[PDB]
Amino acid sequence: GLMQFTLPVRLCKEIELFHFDIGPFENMWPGIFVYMVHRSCGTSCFELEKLCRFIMSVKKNYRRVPYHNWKHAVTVAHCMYAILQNNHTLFTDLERKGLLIACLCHDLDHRGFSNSYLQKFDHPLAALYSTSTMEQHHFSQTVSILQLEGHNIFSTLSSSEYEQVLEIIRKAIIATDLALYFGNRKQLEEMYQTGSLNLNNQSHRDRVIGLMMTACDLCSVTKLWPVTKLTANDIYAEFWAEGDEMKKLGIQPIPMMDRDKKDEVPQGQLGFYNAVAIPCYTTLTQILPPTEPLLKACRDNLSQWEKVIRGEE
Numbered sequence: 001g002l003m004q005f006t007l008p009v010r011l012c013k014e015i016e017l018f019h020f021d022i023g024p025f026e027n028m029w030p031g032i033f034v035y036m037v038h039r040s041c042g043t044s045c046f047e048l049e050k051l052c053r054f055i056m057s058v059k060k061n062y063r064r065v066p067y068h069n070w071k072h073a074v075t076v077a078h079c080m081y082a083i084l085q086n087n088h089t090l091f092t093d094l095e096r097k098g099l100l101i102a103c104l105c106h107d108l109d110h111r112g113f114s115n116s117y118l119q120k121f122d123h124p125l126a127a128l129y130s131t132s133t134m135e136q137h138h139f140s141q142t143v144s145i146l147q148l149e150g151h152n153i154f155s156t157l158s159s160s161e162y163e164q165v166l167e168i169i170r171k172a173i174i175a176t177d178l179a180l181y182f183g184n185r186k187q188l189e190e191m192y193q194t195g196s197l198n199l200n201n202q203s204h205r206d207r208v209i210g211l212m213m214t215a216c217d218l219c220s221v222t223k224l225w226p227v228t229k230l231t232a233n234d235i236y237a238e239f240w241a242e243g244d245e246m247k248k249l250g251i252q253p254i255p256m257m258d259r260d261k262k263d264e265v266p267q268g269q270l271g272f273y274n275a276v277a278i279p280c281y282t283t284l285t286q287i288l289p290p291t292e293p294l295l296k297a298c299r300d301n302l303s304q305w306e307k308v309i310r311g312e313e
């Protein structure tokens with residue numbers, strides 16, 4: 001009960017900032033996550049024994065892939081922590097509980113391959129889940145872990161509160177399908193500009209939570225340039241392995257996944273920042289003004305990729 005988690009001073013301070021990097025010490029990440037749950041949600045919202053056992057089962061169900069791994073899960077949870085702590089009063093008690101867990105679980109059992117590769121390979125998961133294939137899998141894996149003996153961190157919630165939190169988690173995890181992001185952001189942009197945006201409207205909150213999930217998921221673009229650049233290497237390690245596997249199916253991969261077109265990465269980053277990242281953090285800042293540091297960091301990194309092309313690095 002009176003057992004707090006305490007980080008060393010540099011982490012205690014920097015964990016509050018959007019651009020925090022959780023570091024290379026894997027064994028500190030569970031404690032970093034519990035710290036964030038305790039400060040974001042309260043020391044009472046989960047039984048520590050049940051939370052610790054849930055965290056370690058989630059960790060075990062992430063694979064040893066270059067990018068879609070346990071570090072990504074905790075990284076995405078930290079960005080959500082930073083958003084929630086900078087928007088104290090905008091979110092319900094159940095939303096705070098559900099969203100940190102959603103972020104931890106959002107890529108559970110990722111194989112390092114896109115929905116598109118699963119469909120072209122004809123993976124069983126593509127037959128079970130026709131759209132948002134991996135994201136429906138990630139939610140299914142989250143529910144499976146919640147149902148292990150002594151893993152139900154939501155046990156002390158009412159039947160109503162329990163169905164609500166699992167509903168928040170399902171929507172949040174599905175929203176991490178970037179194919180769904182484009183239409184979600186357009187609708188939010190329309191609603192904000194016509195002044196029809198209403199945070200008491202559940203379907204409006206759902207859309208705002210969805211954009212938060214995209215923002216947290218893409219948060220490598222909001223880090224210090226060396227973190228952004230080094231994270232990009234892990235992203236391309238997976239893209240290019242998928243491209244290799246496309247070539248094995250006798251399919252020319254898109255340039256993004258073709259290690260032969262390594263040369264064009266800088267321009268591909270510009271397209272990504274302009275088409276996906278900048279619009280995401282722009283709309284998020286309009287709806288939630290205190291998330292502006294994410295947009296500022298993203299713009300700083302866009303400027304770094306522009307310097308790479310101009311041969312200044």
Ligand SMILES: Cn1ncc(C(=O)N2CCOCC2)c1C(=O)Nc1ccn2cc(-c3ccccc3)nc2c1
Pocket residue numbers: 178217218219220221232235255256257261262264265266267268269271272
């Ligand atoms: C930084 N960041 N963060 C998350 C993601 C991301 O999208 N994820 C979804 C898939 O799962 C990984 C995260 C990225 C990213 O680099 N995106 C992209 C997106 C589109 N591109 C086109 C090219 C490219 C084109 C031509 C030649 C060479 C490269 N390169 C890119 C990188």
Ligand SMILES: [Mg+2]
Pocket residue numbers: 106107134176177
């Ligand atoms: Mg994902």
Ligand SMILES: [Zn+2]
Pocket residue numbers: 072076106107176217
């Ligand atoms: Zn992810």
